[PDB]
C-alpha cells in the first residue's frame, strides 16, 4: 500500500569489524600509568534476546594484544643501557652442581683510557666457552640491552576499550566453548582486568572457569592445535630462588652502570616450585574427565613431558619477582588414566640473557634481584598437545595462546546506527 | 523500562524505534604507545559520526531521529507487510535483508531533498 521509506538514526545493529583498541588502568614496562583511568562505574548492559556468533580463534583482540605487548617491550628498553662492552673474554670459575659461575673480565671505566678487572656471577645458560675462558651467549648473534632496574615485570590489570562508535560483546555462557552462538550476550565498553602474564605450559594468575572445567581448540582432531584447557578450581604453585643474591653496580661509562651479581650471601640452593600433589591430582582428574567427551569413554588418557624444542617451551617458563625461571615439568605430567602433606617439586633453572619473544637480533639482560625471591601464583589454565591410546603433553610458545585464554569472552563490533525501513509516512509540501 | 545501550538489540523494530536516543548518546562519548593509538581512535570516532550526520544533512533529516521521506518503498527491496516488520523482525535482521539495496536508497534520499528545496526556492520566488 502507501509505504514510503523512513530514516531511523540510532538503531541497535552492528557489524563485525576490527579497530585499534586503547588501554585503561586504575592507579611498569606495560606503562599502565599512561592508560586512561579505569572508570569506577563499569557499565555492563545485558542484551536480552540476542544471540551472537563468536570465534575466539579469529578474534583480532588477541592479534592486537600480542603486538601491543611486544611494542611495549621494545619501548621500555630504549633509554636503558647497552651491555655491548660486556661482550669480552671472561675468565670464569665454578662457585664453591657447577651451575652458576664466577667470571672476571677487564672492563672499561669512566675514563676512556682506564681498564678495571672486575668480577661478576653468571648462570650457566648465559655463558659459553671458546681458569677457562667464556663469553656471553648473545655476543655472536645480537646486541644486548640491560633492562632498566626501575620498571617492574609485574602483570598489572589491563583493560582493552573500543573507541566511540564501536562496542565489545561479552559472553555470559558458563559452559561456552571456543566457538558457536553465545546464548546470553552483553555489551561492555572495556574488557575486564587482564594481567599480561607471559607464561608457558601453565597459565598463571589467569581467570577461572565457572561451573565445570572447560577445554577449547579449533579442531580437537587436529593434533597441531594447542589445547587450551582452563580450570575451574585453582591449583596453587609456590616458586622460589632461595639464594640471597647481591647486586653490584659497575660503572662501565659516563652515566652507564652495569648491574652485576656480586656474590651469594649464605647457602647455595636450588630454585624450584611446589604444587600440592592432591590438588594437582584432582585437577588432572577433572581435566581427564572432560577429555573423554570427544575422545572416548574407554580410551586411555596419558600424560608425558615435552618431547623437544627450546628451553622456553620444554619447561614452565615464567617470571617470579623479576627473574626468569625455567621449571622442569616432568613431575606434573607423568600419569596414565584408565577408563575407570603432599608436594611435587619442579627443578627450575634461572637465566638472565633472554630473548623475550622470537625476536631476532635483540637480547635483554635482566638485572639481578637482591634478596630471596619467592612468588605465590595460581595455575588456572594449561596448554596441552596430544600425540596421535591418547597421550597429552604440555607446551606452547606462541604467546597469543595466552591472550586467547582471556579474550575468548570478547568480540569487537562496529555500530552502524543508520537504518532505512518503510511505513505509511510522507513529508508535506 | 530503561534497557540501556543496545538494550533492545533483540527486540522488535517497533520496540527499538522508541529507544533511539539511548544509542545516540554513546555514539560520540561512550557508555606514548596508546597516546598515538588513543589519538588515532579519537579521530576515527568523529569521522564516523560526521559521516552519519552528513547523510542526515543531505536527506533533510538533520536533527531528526525518526525522519519521514518522499521515496516510496519499492517492493523489490522487501515484499514484507508492515505488521510483519515492526512487530516481528529485529533491526539486526532487517539490516541483513536490506543489505544490498541499502546503497540505492541513500541516493534516492539525496535528490529527493535537492529537488525539494529547489521547489521551495521557487515556492518563495513570489
Amino acid at each position, epitope marked *: 500500500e502507501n509505504l514510503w521509506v523512513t530514516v531511523y538514526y540510532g538503531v541497535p545493529v552492528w557489524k563485525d569489524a576490527e579497530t585499534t583498541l586503547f588501554c585503561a588502568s586504575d592507579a611498569n614496562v606495560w606503562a599502565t600509568h599512561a592508560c586512561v583511568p579505569t572508570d569506577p562505574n563499569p557499565q555492563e548492559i545485558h542484551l536480552e534476546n540476542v544471540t551472537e*556468533e563468536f570465534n575466539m580463534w579469529k578474534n583480532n583482540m588477541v592479534e592486537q594484544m600480542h603486538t601491543d605487548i611486544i611494542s611495549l617491550w621494545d619501548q621500555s628498553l630504549k633509554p636503558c643501557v647497552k651491555l655491548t662492552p660486556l661482550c669480552v673474554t671472561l675468565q670464569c670459575t665454578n662457585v664453591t652442581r657447577g651451575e652458576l659461575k664466577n667470571c672476571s673480565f677487564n672492563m672499561t671505566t669512566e675514563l676512556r683510557d682506564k681498564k678495571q678487572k672486575v668480577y661478576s656471577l653468571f648462570y650457566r645458560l648465559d655463558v659459553v666457552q671458546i681458569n677457562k675462558e667464556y663469553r656471553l651467549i648473545n655476543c655472536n648473534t645480537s646486541a644486548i640491552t640491560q633492562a632498566c632496574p626501575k620498571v617492574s615485570f609485574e602483570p598489572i590489570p589491563i583493560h582493552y576499550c573500543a573507541p566511540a562508535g564501536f562496542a565489545i560483546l561479552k559472553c555470559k555462557d558458563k559452559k561456552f566453548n571456543g566457538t558457536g552462538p553465545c546464548p546470553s550476550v552483553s555489551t561492555v565498553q572495556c574488557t575486564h582486568g587482564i594481567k599480561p602474564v607471559v607464561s608457558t605450559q601453565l597459565l598463571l594468575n589467569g581467570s577461572l572457569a565457572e561451573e565445570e572445567v572447560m577445554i577449547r581448540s579449533e579442531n580437537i582432531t587436529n593434533n597441531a592445535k594447542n589445547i587450551l584447557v582452563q580450570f575451574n578450581t585453582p591449583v596453587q604453585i609456590n616458586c622460589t630462588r632461595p639464594n640471597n643474591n647481591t647486586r653490584k653496580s659497575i660503572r662501565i661509562g659516563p652515566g652507564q652502570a652495569f648491574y652485576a651479581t656480586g656474590d651469594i650471601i649464605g647457602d647455595i640452593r636450588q630454585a624450584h616450585c611446589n604444587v600440592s600433589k592432591a590438588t594437582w591430582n584432582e585437577t588432572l582428574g577433572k581435566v581427564v574427565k572432560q577429555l573423554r567427551k570427544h575422545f572416548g569413554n574407554n580410551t586411555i588418557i596419558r600424560f608425558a613431558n615435552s618431547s623437544g624444542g627450546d628451553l622456553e617451551v620444554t619447561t614452565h617458563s615464567f617470571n617470579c619477582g623479576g627473574e626468569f625461571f625455567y621449571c622442569n615439568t616432568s613431575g606434573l605430567f607423568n600419569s596414565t588414566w584408565i577408563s575407570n602433606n603432599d608436594s611435587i617439586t619442579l627443578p627450575c633453572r634461572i637465566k638472565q640473557i633472554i630473548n623475550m619473544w622470537q625476536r631476532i637480533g635483540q637480547a635483554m639482560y635482566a638485572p639481578p634481584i637482591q634478596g630471596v625471591i619467592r612468588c605465590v601464583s595460581n595455575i588456572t589454565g594449561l596448554i596441552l598437545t596430544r600425540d596421535g591410546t591418547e597421550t597429552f603433553r604440555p607446551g606452547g610458545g606462541d604467546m597469543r595462546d595466552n591472550w586467547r585464554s582471556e579474550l575468548y569472552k570478547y568480540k569487537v563490533v562496529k555500530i552502524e546506527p543508520l537504518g532505512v525501513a518503510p511505513t505509511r509516512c510522507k513529508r508535506r509540501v | 523500562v530503561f534497557l540501556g545501550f543496545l538494550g533492545a538489540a533483540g527486540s*522488535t523494530m517497533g520496540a527499538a524505534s522508541m529507544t533511539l536516543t539511548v544509542q545516540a548518546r554513546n555514539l560520540l562519548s561512550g557508555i606514548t604507545v596508546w597516546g598515538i593509538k588513543q589519538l588515532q581512535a579519537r579521530v576515527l570516532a568523529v569521522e564516523r559520526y560526521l559521516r552519519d550526520q552528513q547523510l542526515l544533512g543531505i536527506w533533510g533529516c538533520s536533527g531528526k531521529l525518526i525522519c519521514c521521506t518522499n521515496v516510496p518503498w519499492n517492493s523489490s527491496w522487501s515484499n514484507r507487510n508492515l505488521s510483519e516488520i515492526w512487530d516481528n523482525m529485529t533491526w539486526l535482521q532487517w539490516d541483513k535483508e536490506i543489505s544490498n539495496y541499502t546503497q540505492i536508497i541513500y541516493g534516492l534520499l539525496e535528490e529527493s531533498q535537492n529537488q525539494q528545496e529547489k521547489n521551495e526556492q521557487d515556492l518563495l520566488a513570489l
Partner: nanobody
Framework: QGQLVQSGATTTKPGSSVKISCKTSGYRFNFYHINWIRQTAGRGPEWMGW????????????????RVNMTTDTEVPVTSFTSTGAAYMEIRNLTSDDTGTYFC????????????????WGQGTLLT
C-alpha cells in the same frame, strides 16, 4: 519459516496419559508461542492453549486447564536468528471423546494484537 515436526500415532486406551512432542527448527524458538489445537471426531476444532517459551507463561482454555500438561525445553541455538526447540503436551483424564488429530502451532508475531495466533503448524498426531 521452519518445521514443527511432531511425534507418532500412539494409540492408548482411556484412563492413561499421552505425551506428544513438538520439535522446532528454522526459527528462534523462544520468540513465538506454541499453541496446541485438536480436531476431534464428535466436535470441530478446539483450541487447547499456548505457552510462551521465553516468559515461561501458560494460557489455556477452561475446558482443558485441569487436564493439560504444557511444558517446554530451552532452545539449543544454531545460528544468530535460528534455534531448535521442544514443546511437550500431555492430557490427564483421557477418554474416547478426546480421540482426534493434535498439532502444535508457532505464534504469529512477537508484538501487536495477534501475537500468539497459531500461524505455523506441524503435521498432526492421531490419538486413541
Amino acid at each position: 519459516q521452519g518445521q514443527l515436526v511432531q511425534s507418532g500415532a500412539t494409540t492408548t486406551k482411556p484412563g492413561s496419559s499421552v505425551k506428544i512432542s513438538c520439535k522446532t527448527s528454522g526459527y528462534r524458538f523462544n520468540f513465538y508461542h506454541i499453541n496446541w489445537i485438536r480436531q476431534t471426531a464428535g466436535r470441530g476444532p478446539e483450541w487447547m492453549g499456548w505457552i510462551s517459551p521465553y516468559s515461561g507463561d501458560k494460557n489455556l482454555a477452561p475446558a482443558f486447564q485441569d487436564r493439560v500438561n504444557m511444558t517446554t525445553d530451552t532452545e539449543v541455538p544454531v545460528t544468530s536468528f535460528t534455534s531448535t526447540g521442544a514443546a511437550y503436551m500431555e492430557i490427564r483424564n483421557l477418554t474416547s471423546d478426546d480421540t482426534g488429530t493434535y498439532f502444535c502451532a508457532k505464534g504469529l508475531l512477537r508484538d501487536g494484537s495477534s501475537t500468539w495466533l497459531p500461524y505455523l503448524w506441524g503435521q498432526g498426531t492421531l490419538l486413541t
